[PDB]
Amino acid sequence: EPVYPDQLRLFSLGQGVCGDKYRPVNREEAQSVKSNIVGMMGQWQISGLANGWVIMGPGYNGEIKPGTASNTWCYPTNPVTGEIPTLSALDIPDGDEVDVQWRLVHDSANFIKPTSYLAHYLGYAWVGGNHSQYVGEDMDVTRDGDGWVIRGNNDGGCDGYRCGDKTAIKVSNFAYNLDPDSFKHGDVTQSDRQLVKTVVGWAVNDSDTPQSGYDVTLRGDTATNWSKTNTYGLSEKVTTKNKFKWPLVGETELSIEIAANQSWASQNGGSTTTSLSQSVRPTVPARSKIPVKIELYKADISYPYEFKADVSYDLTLSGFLRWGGNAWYTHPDNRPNWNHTFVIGPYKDKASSIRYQWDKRYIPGEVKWWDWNWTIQQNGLSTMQNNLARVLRPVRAGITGDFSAESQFAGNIEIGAPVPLGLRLEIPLDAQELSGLGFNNVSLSVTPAA
Amino acid sequence: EPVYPDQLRLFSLGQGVCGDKYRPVNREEAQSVKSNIVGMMGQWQISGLANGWVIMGPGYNGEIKPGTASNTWCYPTNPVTGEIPTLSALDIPDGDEVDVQWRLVHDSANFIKPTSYLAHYLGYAWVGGNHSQYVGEDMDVTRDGDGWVIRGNNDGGCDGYRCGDKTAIKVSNFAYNLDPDSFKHGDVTQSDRQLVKTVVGWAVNDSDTPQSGYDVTLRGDTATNWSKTNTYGLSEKVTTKNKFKWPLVGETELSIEIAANQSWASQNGGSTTTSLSQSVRPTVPARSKIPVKIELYKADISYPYEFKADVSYDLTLSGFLRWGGNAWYTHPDNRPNWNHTFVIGPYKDKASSIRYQWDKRYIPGEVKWWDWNWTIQQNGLSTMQNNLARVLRPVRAGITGDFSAESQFAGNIEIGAPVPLGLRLEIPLDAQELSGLGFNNVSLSVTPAA
Numbered sequence: 001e002p003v004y005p006d007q008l009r010l011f012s013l014g015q016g017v018c019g020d021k022y023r024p025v026n027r028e029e030a031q032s033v034k035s036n037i038v039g040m041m042g043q044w045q046i047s048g049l050a051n052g053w054v055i056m057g058p059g060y061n062g063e064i065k066p067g068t069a070s071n072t073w074c075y076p077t078n079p080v081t082g083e084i085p086t087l088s089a090l091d092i093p094d095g096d097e098v099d100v101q102w103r104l105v106h107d108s109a110n111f112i113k114p115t116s117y118l119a120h121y122l123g124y125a126w127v128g129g130n131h132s133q134y135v136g137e138d139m140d141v142t143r144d145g146d147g148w149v150i151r152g153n154n155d156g157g158c159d160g161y162r163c164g165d166k167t168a169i170k171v172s173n174f175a176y177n178l179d180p181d182s183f184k185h186g187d188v189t190q191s192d193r194q195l196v197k198t199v200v201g202w203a204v205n206d207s208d209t210p211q212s213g214y215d216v217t218l219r220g221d222t223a224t225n226w227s228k229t230n231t232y233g234l235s236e237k238v239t240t241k242n243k244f245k246w247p248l249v250g251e252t253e254l255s256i257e258i259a260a261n262q263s264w265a266s267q268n269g270g271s272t273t274t275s276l277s278q279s280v281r282p283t284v285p286a287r288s289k290i291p292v293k294i295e296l297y298k299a300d301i302s303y304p305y306e307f308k309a310d311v312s313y314d315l316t317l318s319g320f321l322r323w324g325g326n327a328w329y330t331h332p333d334n335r336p337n338w339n340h341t342f343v344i345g346p347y348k349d350k351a352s353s354i355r356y357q358w359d360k361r362y363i364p365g366e367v368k369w370w371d372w373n374w375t376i377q378q379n380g381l382s383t384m385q386n387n388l389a390r391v392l393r394p395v396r397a398g399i400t401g402d403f404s405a406e407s408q409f410a411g412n413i414e415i416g417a418p419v420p421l422g423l424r425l426e427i428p429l430d431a432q433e434l435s436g437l438g439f440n441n442v443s444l445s446v447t448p449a450a
Numbered sequence: 451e452p453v454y455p456d457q458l459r460l461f462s463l464g465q466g467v468c469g470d471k472y473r474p475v476n477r478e479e480a481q482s483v484k485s486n487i488v489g490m491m492g493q494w495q496i497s498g499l500a501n502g503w504v505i506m507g508p509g510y511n512g513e514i515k516p517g518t519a520s521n522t523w524c525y526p527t528n529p530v531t532g533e534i535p536t537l538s539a540l541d542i543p544d545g546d547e548v549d550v551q552w553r554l555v556h557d558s559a560n561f562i563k564p565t566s567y568l569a570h571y572l573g574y575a576w577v578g579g580n581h582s583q584y585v586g587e588d589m590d591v592t593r594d595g596d597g598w599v600i601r602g603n604n605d606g607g608c609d610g611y612r613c614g615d616k617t618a619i620k621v622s623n624f625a626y627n628l629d630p631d632s633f634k635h636g637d638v639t640q641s642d643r644q645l646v647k648t649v650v651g652w653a654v655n656d657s658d659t660p661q662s663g664y665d666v667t668l669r670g671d672t673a674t675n676w677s678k679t680n681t682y683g684l685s686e687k688v689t690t691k692n693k694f695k696w697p698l699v700g701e702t703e704l705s706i707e708i709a710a711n712q713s714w715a716s717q718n719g720g721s722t723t724t725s726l727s728q729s730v731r732p733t734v735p736a737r738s739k740i741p742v743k744i745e746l747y748k749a750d751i752s753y754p755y756e757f758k759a760d761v762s763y764d765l766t767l768s769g770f771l772r773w774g775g776n777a778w779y780t781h782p783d784n785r786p787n788w789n790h791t792f793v794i795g796p797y798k799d800k801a802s803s804i805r806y807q808w809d810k811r812y813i814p815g816e817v818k819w820w821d822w823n824w825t826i827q828q829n830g831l832s833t834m835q836n837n838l839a840r841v842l843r844p845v846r847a848g849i850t851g852d853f854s855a856e857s858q859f860a861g862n863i864e865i866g867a868p869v870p871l872g873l874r875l876e877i878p879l880d881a882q883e884l885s886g887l888g889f890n891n892v893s894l895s896v897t898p899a900a
């Protein structure tokens with residue numbers, strides 16, 4: 001009965017019209033998940049709803065009001081019910097890699113219990129230590145190269161058929177993707193925008209024609225010099241998927257690009273040369289000159305910073321599958337030894353994706369791995385939704401350090417009131433002082449706007 | 451010449467087909483704005499791109515690959531160009547409201563210049579004081595009953611036609627919206643999650659056939675206590691637009707609801723009954739009892755928290771429009787007194803929103819206030835873009851203080867494997883003892899899942 005916004009589909013077939021298998025979303029349903037729908041919309045997008053209503057984009061504040069639209073937000077006549085909720089992220093503060101993983105995989109409520117449950121619901125046998133009669137208790141977490149293994153304790157002996165063969169949950173292949181958008185910074189340790197030099201003068205119009213087609217344009221270059229630290233080692237293994245420019249704090253401007261596919265901890269500063277470029281379209285009255293000034297600045301900035309890195313890992317379940325109750329699509333009854341890897345994080349393929357397999361579980365052709373319906377048959381839709389929501393809970397780790405920059409730049413060429421006496425400049429540029437100041441190859445040139 | 455996510459439109463018109471005036475987005479362009487496109491997509495939606503490529507929705511990690519789809523992501527053959535960039539937030543350090551307003555309107559480079567320039571680009575006369583030849587200089591900032599007034603110093607004489615009639619920029623109707631997603635916190639002052647009692651016992655199936663039709667259900671209730679402080683008083687005037695759950699720090703799951711349209715400072719919390727209602731539908735074999743166990747915990751967390759509140763305000767330009775040079779759509783030529791207000795912040799209506807006007811500038815019927823194509827022609831596109839980008843640059847204020855919570859709760863009901871001898875329970879519950887631990891009206895009962 002809840003509308004799942006991740007199942008909406010937009011059609012462009014004319015007023016109130018959906019493609020085969022879809023039907024228009026109504027004003028009340030769209031109200032119930034309103035921020036999800038708007039967030040799936042373009043700034044000024046206006047899309048239709050049932051029965052003469054439209055929802056508007058974030059630029060209009062996601063307003064729902066009567067109106068007509070040739071494109072319509074639609075919802076399946078046969079939606080997939082019982083989606084797996086997405087829980088709030090679990091944030092792990094910055095530390096060394098081993099310590100960050102440890103806080104993750106040794107957490108009984110958020111990792112050991114959920115994943116052991118998962119094993120157990122799929123029919124994996126013996127998911128717990130010998131010191132508990134409950135699933136995912138008495139579980140030893142031990143290092144395995146760059147990951148970990150969690151497996152019931154095996155001290156002393158046991159009963160049960162093959163009871164010594166505990167199921168293992170191997171956590172490996174951790175990756176950490178830094179999210180630029182998660183940037184945050186503590187108090188500005190140091191800040192100041194300092195007027196270093198002013199370049200001042202005149203542009204004259206020596207002619208009868210009121211000159212006004214020309215750009216006047218500053219050129220030249222300077223440096224941004226920056227550095228950062230990394231408080232812990234996890235930074236050695238952290239990357240960012242796409243390059244981004246270091247974010248703007250306050251009234252400064254830097255040219256720092258962080259690069260993709262390269263250690264966070266191996267990008268600790270350096271000197272990139274920003275570029276001077278300002279232009280200005282002045283209109284100059286009948287044989288008059290105009291005052292012209294360009295302010296040159298240096299700026300320092302420094303603060304502690306925090307980004308968050310999305311942690312992903314592979315979870316491999318290994319053990320035998322029980323006679324007369326397991327969830328492999330072929331329902332083997334011979335207790336074969338099994339190994340399956342689920343990718344916990346960004347999707348890699350169908351076989352390794354609980355979300356895919358679960359969302360498609362009513363499509364017979366798609367069921368080539370686990371039989372999720374069987375697990376619902378066993379435990380109820382509820383229990384599975386909540387277990388899987390926990391298993392899939394997003395994990396982030398804090399990546400921290402101190403940041404520091406200084407850069408130089410030029411303000412906008414500023415233009416004054418025209419006073420009376422193909423445009424001409426009279427704005428002295430002391431190449432040598434500027435160069436001494438750090439402003440190199442500076443040049444002022446006049447050229448046409450068309 | 452980047453692709454503007456805003457101008458993307460999805461068409462469902464068969465493989466490869468766009469609506470008139472649009473063209474398919476190619477795989478390189480999809481790639482450059484991937485997260486934008488993916489965020490407009492159903493979980494498993496697959497959508498066409500140029501030349502037999504497709505992009506897949508978030509469930510598939512935004513993957514781009516060869517494929518066919520009957521809907522297509524398109525882009526205009528003639529896009530609207532020069533979108534006003536969106537700069538990162540200007541961050542004002544927490545203070546009283548008077549401190550936050552003071553800091554904002556007195557900021558020359560971030561407020562006085564850009565607003566002064568904007569008024570000058572629109573044709574307002576004399577945006578500047580007597581003691582400077584430049585726009586947005588020698589500007590007095592005075593208080594006008596409530597908000598502010600920025601206006602050229604008018605002391606001693608001035609030259610120029612009508613030069614005593616200085617344009618004024620007034621700041622007023624401030625508001626402050628807490629952005630929940632801007633959360634960060636300081637040192638996690640104190641944390642801990644402690645077992646206070648284990649309830650154990652049995653559930654019996656005395657009947658001859660297996661039993662799967664009963665929920666075993668825990669009831670009762672516990673208090674949750676949380677408190678927050680407010681370092682400053684801007685907090686009295688902050689609101690959130692929508693309710694949100696206090697965020698999850700640490701491992702701890704606590705339930706807290708910040709309500710909309712209610713002062714931040716008015717919600718420092720207190721004590722809130724939460725229920726322990728919990729349920730499980732076990733399957734007990736013929737003639738058997740399962741071991742049962744419920745764990746009871748207390749947890750507490752505390753820390754300095756920090757959220758950012760968006761500052762929004764009305765910006766009113768008052769002065770006369772120059773003869774032979776203004777942006778009002780009718781281009782008046784009689785130096786009329788003009789007052790116009792823009793809403794710097796969430797959209798309210800067309801007249802008072804720069805972004806809307808800017809973006810719709812090429813629709814002659816939508817030009818009923820300012821002529822932004824004329825501003826572009828007069829000053830150049832880069833210059834207006836950069837100017838408007840400074841005037842629309844988000845301003846935020848830090849909302850800080852201390853957070854603390856105590857909570858009690860039960861782990862899920864756990865079930866052991868069936869051992870041989872609706873459904874019967876022998877699980878002790880000492881009314882008193884439990885109450886002394888902060889667990890009230892505790893009960894365990896069995897009912898039909900129907």
Ligand SMILES: O=P(O)(O)OC[C@H]1O[C@H](O)[C@@H](O)[C@@H](O)[C@@H]1O
Pocket residue numbers: 124125126127160161321322323324325335867
């Ligand atoms: O019934 P199966 O397939 O042999 O499972 C073998 C074992 O699996 C589970 O882990 C437990 O219930 C054991 O007591 C059981 O004997």
Ligand SMILES: O=P(O)(O)OC[C@H]1O[C@H](O)[C@@H](O)[C@@H](O)[C@@H]1O
Pocket residue numbers: 417418574575576577610611771772773774775785
């Ligand atoms: O005569 P107008 O064009 O109405 O403008 C009057 C004055 O306005 C502006 O502030 C300046 O450009 C002046 O040089 C001009 O004299």
